[PDB]
Each structure stands twice: as C-alpha cells, then as structure tokens.
Design a protein around this nucleic acid. Structure first.
Lengths: 65, 62
DNA sequence: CGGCCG
DNA sequence: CGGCCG
C-alpha cells in the first residue's frame, strides 16, 4: 500500500537520521517529495500510536521515539 | 472579487443581525471552505465583515 | 504559519 | 475541529 510505503519511507528516514536527532515535517516533506499535508497525517498517526515522539514547538520536531 | 460579493450578498439576504459559519456558507454557495474562509477573514480584516471569535467562528455584516 | 482536518 | 495558510 502507498500509505504504508510513505510510513516506511518516513520511518526509514528518521532511523537513518538517527534515533536521537529530530526534524520537521517540512524537511521530511521536502526530502521525500511528498506534500506536507500527507507527511503530517502520517507523522501524527505514527505518533498517535507511539512509534514517533513529537516535540512541541513551532514548527513541531519529530524523531524515532 | 466575485466571491466577496456573493458571501456579502448571502450575509445580507440573511440579516445583518444573524451570523453564520463558513461551513454553512461553503455548503450553501457550492464553494470550498478554504475559499470561503480566505474571503471571510479578508473581509473582516477590512472591516466589511464582523467575526465573533469562537469554534466555529461566526460571521455577519459589519 | 502551529494546520494533522476527514 | 479553531484552519484563513500562499
């Protein structure tokens, strides 16, 4: 599934960045060439489950929990 | 422009005392809520429309 | 400007 | 659930 392809590309990217480090949906969107909206829906969904950790701020930071 | 007059026209044919949400607006003019809100927030900044902060927010003739 | 939202 | 936002 595409949606699942995009969740994995996102996880793969965050894991490659490293478990500590975090980035913004914007960088993610840019690097994966996927609209920011679609990146945030996955980002917040993966976080809603507990896979990713969202650090509040503006704009929010995202890293593998 | 055409949208500014439509929205204001509906908010007129409605009643300067009675407000309304963008949603009722967007689904009454066959237009995206994004458009409605763009116009709405613009018309209010100019003073032509009045916004009552809320959730949802209500708009009426100023 | 945070916006994920459908 | 507020979202207008490019």
């Amino acid at each position: 599934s595409i949606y699942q392809d995009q969740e994995q590309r996102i996880l793969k990217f965050l894991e490659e960045l490293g478990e500590g480090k975090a980035t913004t949906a914007h960088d993610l969107s840019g690097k994966l060439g996927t609209p920011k909206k679609e990146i945030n829906r996955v980002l917040y969904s993966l976080a809603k489950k507990g896979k990713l950790q969202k650090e509040a701020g503006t704009p929010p930071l995202w890293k593998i929990a």
